[PDB]
Amino acid sequence: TQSHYGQCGGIGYSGPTVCASGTTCQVLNPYASQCL
């Protein structure tokens, strides 16, 4: 599982979000709202 530092939205992406909960899906660089 791509638990931490996992891309959820931005440049080049779609939705292969094979992440866990506990971590999230929130903003940093233009590539990623991401599993922090």
Helices (H) and strands (E) in the chain — how many of each? 0, 3
Q: Quote the domain boundaries for residue 1.
A: 1-36
Structure tokens at 28: 């940093």
**Tally of structural domains, the chain:** 1
Residue 23 Cα distances to 12, 15, 18, 19, 34, angstroms: 22, 17, 12, 8, 9
Q: For the CA atoms of 7, 25, 28, 10, what is the dihedral angle to 10 degrees?
A: 50
Nearest Cα to Cα of residue 34 among 25, 11, 23: 25
The DSSP element (H or E) to which 27 belongs, if any, is strand 26-27
Distance CA 23, CA 36 (A): 5
User: Residue 16 corresponds to which tokens in the numbers above?
Assistant: 């292969």
What lies within 8 Å, CB to CB, of 32 at 6+ separation is 7, 8, 9, 10, 13
- Which method was it determined by? NMR
